RNA sequence: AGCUGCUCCCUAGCAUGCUACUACCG
RNA sequence: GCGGUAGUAGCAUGCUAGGGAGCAG
């Protein structure tokens, strides 16, 4: 504070007090001027020291308001993200096989573990070594889960394409050896 | 962080508003920022007030507010001015000698490299400062060259002849053989790989790199590089050898290079060769002649 | 003498790892096996065998300038 | 209670970058590791108290190196230390005596 | 913190009181010196404390920014410090088998696969010229990694099998010299 | 990239409390 | 001369908060 009502009173009080001190009139003049400048600094104390809690509290409030606004924007952002994800993953399951197996239930309830088994259009097989490959995904087509699948594309642990003519018993020690087969459901 | 250019003392500050953000010491940077208009410095963190959505970017008005730098109306009860004593608060505030003659770097920074005195200072200054002037030249030309228009061809008139169309707000620069264009072919995903070409008025005559088909909608733009800082000066502090060092003369004399035998010894004992050679005086014949001075 | 060889093995596998070697599954598997076997050894005559084997991997690539780093 | 010495030494030797390999930047890591290893000084085996004494000596070395850097590069000195307590054993002894001062 | 202005006041009145305690004087002029010192030890005992705390505040801020700078600069040079440290430690280790392969790689003889430890398994090494072949190869034996191997086949850069007898000083400029020797451990 | 418990160091805030100095009054 | 209230400076205990780090299950 520099331009509040107490300042003018205090300043003029001490100016007149010290002008009269330069005059040097009495002994009660000193007492009176010092009492005035004791009670006028008792005005510049409340008005210049406790006036400053108001500003600090207002700044507390302003920072809290800023924080609340930011926290309110983040919620809308994450809500939009979640509902976009839900709607984008919805656009793949609304097929005609799902409707079939749901209309074959007696209440509309089915176990979840059978939904990929009877409706998924693509299958992925992970093979550790050659004997397991020879027992499961042999040739161009194979049978699994009461269905028949046809192979397209084989990769290795480095994600590099392997041809079906390289997977032999002699060339086995030269392959990165988890193999990942991708197959499509045959009609 | 490291030593500065003009001062060679370790520092941690930059001119934010200046061109190529050089290293500058406490008093060093203070002279550079108070003698001219660059008034934004970057320490390990930038010198800005973190007040939510505030504006100021000056250096002499922001203050210290504990952990961060704050604005005047934003500053806490008691502060400590960041820019006083003739120094800006930063690393290694003691071991800083500074400088008085700062007109060189100030002129080199505030200049636009448009007139003759620009290059006069660019050469006649300090060699490190002239390397900096070189990089500033490159940056300025890069920034001014992409600022021109984009060549959006829409027609197909002939081979080596087409029609040009350019956008609003950017003029079309001189279609010269001095500055090569650069184009990219459109597709649904990206647009890349047509090469560097050279256009001029015709109808628009184009000078193509290699024969291909001229499609529709391809843009031709004066693209820019990503120019990098320099390390070594223009040349070395020079020397005359006492011996023929790392070298030994030949044994025979060459017919086409008999006119330059007096030119063999004279530089075999120093680094540089200050050439004064007019176009077509055997300018390059010595490039193959002095080559076989010693084939090893 | 065993402590030195174990510390050198740790540093060597760090150098191999930051040269983008784990992008080849077989090579990374062999390197990991050798590094883990050196750290569990009890006599300092097989640790040097496996150290020769593991350093040959770095020597067979071309990402390090041998003449420059060995200025002595 | 006391720990296995090799666990303390291994914690001192192998880290995850920056977190060590530059001791002057953390220092408090070794203070905590010496708090954990103080009771080894009361073991009959003499190769066990050497761990605590090695940690104290390293703490002193780190403090000296940081101060030397600081004065050789700005000109600056920490005015009053209040840090010599970290390489004297009373600070670590007080953590195992029944009068809680946490 | 004596370089502050108010110190000159605090001494001044204190000096007066010194004279007072030397004089043995009346009661009121000592009230004077107990009314103009407690205003000095109050106008000064406030300036000489906040500034003293500010000095340490500046010191701690500078140390924090220095810590940040050095940590930032340390993790930008890992790929060079690590290799330098590795080769320093290898040099200190002082092993014959490691020195052999390091020096061979320094000259140019480098392997093409992991060096095997079993007495079985195949080794393939590159040979860049004749000098290394001469001081490394002798008849049908190969000295490498402080071990002995027997040769099985020599080739050149165009993948064409070369018999061993023709490799010599005079026939050298007739073969693609980056030879590839295949051997097996004894 | 997890759930807990314990400990060390630095900063800021508030309350409380202690102690000292100035002013008013009784 | 003492008590009270209003001020200014230093010290002490704990309570919340923010950051870095160590150990154990
Ligand atoms: Zn500038
Ligand atoms: Zn601001």
PDB file of N, CA, C and O in Angstrom, chain E residues 79-102:
ATOM      1  N   UNK E  79      27.561 -43.499 -25.573  1.00  0.00           N
ATOM      2  CA  UNK E  79      28.040 -44.365 -26.645  1.00  0.00           C
ATOM      3  C   UNK E  79      29.539 -44.231 -26.903  1.00  0.00           C
ATOM      4  O   UNK E  79      30.118 -45.077 -27.588  1.00  0.00           O
ATOM      5  N   UNK E  80      30.186 -43.215 -26.363  1.00  0.00           N
ATOM      6  CA  UNK E  80      31.628 -43.067 -26.506  1.00  0.00           C
ATOM      7  C   UNK E  80      32.375 -43.389 -25.227  1.00  0.00           C
ATOM      8  O   UNK E  80      33.413 -44.069 -25.264  1.00  0.00           O
ATOM      9  N   UNK E  81      31.856 -42.920 -24.092  1.00  0.00           N
ATOM     10  CA  UNK E  81      32.452 -43.244 -22.806  1.00  0.00           C
ATOM     11  C   UNK E  81      32.436 -44.743 -22.558  1.00  0.00           C
ATOM     12  O   UNK E  81      33.396 -45.298 -22.012  1.00  0.00           O
ATOM     13  N   UNK E  82      31.353 -45.418 -22.954  1.00  0.00           N
ATOM     14  CA  UNK E  82      31.257 -46.854 -22.717  1.00  0.00           C
ATOM     15  C   UNK E  82      32.318 -47.624 -23.496  1.00  0.00           C
ATOM     16  O   UNK E  82      32.955 -48.531 -22.950  1.00  0.00           O
ATOM     17  N   UNK E  83      32.532 -47.273 -24.767  1.00  0.00           N
ATOM     18  CA  UNK E  83      33.550 -47.955 -25.563  1.00  0.00           C
ATOM     19  C   UNK E  83      34.953 -47.655 -25.049  1.00  0.00           C
ATOM     20  O   UNK E  83      35.808 -48.555 -24.990  1.00  0.00           O
ATOM     21  N   UNK E  84      35.211 -46.400 -24.662  1.00  0.00           N
ATOM     22  CA  UNK E  84      36.513 -46.069 -24.092  1.00  0.00           C
ATOM     23  C   UNK E  84      36.780 -46.868 -22.821  1.00  0.00           C
ATOM     24  O   UNK E  84      37.875 -47.417 -22.637  1.00  0.00           O
ATOM     25  N   UNK E  85      35.784 -46.952 -21.935  1.00  0.00           N
ATOM     26  CA  UNK E  85      35.948 -47.713 -20.702  1.00  0.00           C
ATOM     27  C   UNK E  85      36.151 -49.193 -20.991  1.00  0.00           C
ATOM     28  O   UNK E  85      36.983 -49.848 -20.352  1.00  0.00           O
ATOM     29  N   UNK E  86      35.404 -49.740 -21.953  1.00  0.00           N
ATOM     30  CA  UNK E  86      35.557 -51.149 -22.291  1.00  0.00           C
ATOM     31  C   UNK E  86      36.974 -51.454 -22.741  1.00  0.00           C
ATOM     32  O   UNK E  86      37.575 -52.442 -22.304  1.00  0.00           O
ATOM     33  N   UNK E  87      37.535 -50.611 -23.605  1.00  0.00           N
ATOM     34  CA  UNK E  87      38.868 -50.936 -24.095  1.00  0.00           C
ATOM     35  C   UNK E  87      39.952 -50.650 -23.063  1.00  0.00           C
ATOM     36  O   UNK E  87      40.968 -51.354 -23.039  1.00  0.00           O
ATOM     37  N   UNK E  88      39.745 -49.673 -22.176  1.00  0.00           N
ATOM     38  CA  UNK E  88      40.666 -49.498 -21.055  1.00  0.00           C
ATOM     39  C   UNK E  88      40.692 -50.737 -20.166  1.00  0.00           C
ATOM     40  O   UNK E  88      41.764 -51.227 -19.785  1.00  0.00           O
ATOM     41  N   UNK E  89      39.512 -51.269 -19.837  1.00  0.00           N
ATOM     42  CA  UNK E  89      39.448 -52.450 -18.982  1.00  0.00           C
ATOM     43  C   UNK E  89      40.046 -53.671 -19.671  1.00  0.00           C
ATOM     44  O   UNK E  89      40.723 -54.482 -19.028  1.00  0.00           O
ATOM     45  N   UNK E  90      39.812 -53.818 -20.977  1.00  0.00           N
ATOM     46  CA  UNK E  90      40.419 -54.925 -21.711  1.00  0.00           C
ATOM     47  C   UNK E  90      41.937 -54.821 -21.715  1.00  0.00           C
ATOM     48  O   UNK E  90      42.634 -55.828 -21.552  1.00  0.00           O
ATOM     49  N   UNK E  91      42.468 -53.611 -21.909  1.00  0.00           N
ATOM     50  CA  UNK E  91      43.913 -53.424 -21.881  1.00  0.00           C
ATOM     51  C   UNK E  91      44.483 -53.765 -20.511  1.00  0.00           C
ATOM     52  O   UNK E  91      45.552 -54.379 -20.409  1.00  0.00           O
ATOM     53  N   UNK E  92      43.780 -53.377 -19.445  1.00  0.00           N
ATOM     54  CA  UNK E  92      44.251 -53.672 -18.093  1.00  0.00           C
ATOM     55  C   UNK E  92      44.185 -55.166 -17.786  1.00  0.00           C
ATOM     56  O   UNK E  92      44.995 -55.678 -17.005  1.00  0.00           O
ATOM     57  N   UNK E  93      43.223 -55.879 -18.379  1.00  0.00           N
ATOM     58  CA  UNK E  93      43.036 -57.298 -18.076  1.00  0.00           C
ATOM     59  C   UNK E  93      44.287 -58.113 -18.388  1.00  0.00           C
ATOM     60  O   UNK E  93      44.643 -59.034 -17.645  1.00  0.00           O
ATOM     61  N   UNK E  94      44.960 -57.791 -19.495  1.00  0.00           N
ATOM     62  CA  UNK E  94      46.234 -58.400 -19.871  1.00  0.00           C
ATOM     63  C   UNK E  94      46.143 -59.909 -20.066  1.00  0.00           C
ATOM     64  O   UNK E  94      46.778 -60.675 -19.333  1.00  0.00           O
ATOM     65  N   UNK E  95      45.369 -60.346 -21.055  1.00  0.00           N
ATOM     66  CA  UNK E  95      45.239 -61.755 -21.393  1.00  0.00           C
ATOM     67  C   UNK E  95      45.836 -62.015 -22.768  1.00  0.00           C
ATOM     68  O   UNK E  95      45.753 -61.174 -23.667  1.00  0.00           O
ATOM     69  N   UNK E  96      46.451 -63.189 -22.925  1.00  0.00           N
ATOM     70  CA  UNK E  96      47.102 -63.524 -24.188  1.00  0.00           C
ATOM     71  C   UNK E  96      46.087 -63.835 -25.282  1.00  0.00           C
ATOM     72  O   UNK E  96      46.214 -63.352 -26.414  1.00  0.00           O
ATOM     73  N   UNK E  97      45.070 -64.637 -24.958  1.00  0.00           N
ATOM     74  CA  UNK E  97      44.064 -65.001 -25.949  1.00  0.00           C
ATOM     75  C   UNK E  97      43.281 -63.787 -26.428  1.00  0.00           C
ATOM     76  O   UNK E  97      42.948 -63.693 -27.613  1.00  0.00           O
ATOM     77  N   UNK E  98      42.969 -62.856 -25.526  1.00  0.00           N
ATOM     78  CA  UNK E  98      42.244 -61.655 -25.918  1.00  0.00           C
ATOM     79  C   UNK E  98      43.131 -60.697 -26.702  1.00  0.00           C
ATOM     80  O   UNK E  98      42.681 -60.087 -27.679  1.00  0.00           O
ATOM     81  N   UNK E  99      44.395 -60.563 -26.292  1.00  0.00           N
ATOM     82  CA  UNK E  99      45.321 -59.698 -27.011  1.00  0.00           C
ATOM     83  C   UNK E  99      45.539 -60.191 -28.433  1.00  0.00           C
ATOM     84  O   UNK E  99      45.647 -59.386 -29.365  1.00  0.00           O
ATOM     85  N   UNK E 100      45.610 -61.509 -28.619  1.00  0.00           N
ATOM     86  CA  UNK E 100      45.814 -62.061 -29.953  1.00  0.00           C
ATOM     87  C   UNK E 100      44.704 -61.629 -30.903  1.00  0.00           C
ATOM     88  O   UNK E 100      44.967 -61.081 -31.981  1.00  0.00           O
ATOM     89  N   UNK E 101      43.450 -61.852 -30.509  1.00  0.00           N
ATOM     90  CA  UNK E 101      42.346 -61.536 -31.407  1.00  0.00           C
ATOM     91  C   UNK E 101      42.175 -60.030 -31.555  1.00  0.00           C
ATOM     92  O   UNK E 101      41.813 -59.550 -32.635  1.00  0.00           O
ATOM     93  N   UNK E 102      42.462 -59.254 -30.505  1.00  0.00           N
ATOM     94  CA  UNK E 102      42.355 -57.803 -30.623  1.00  0.00           C
ATOM     95  C   UNK E 102      43.382 -57.265 -31.614  1.00  0.00           C
ATOM     96  O   UNK E 102      43.061 -56.431 -32.466  1.00  0.00           O
TER      97      UNK E 102
END
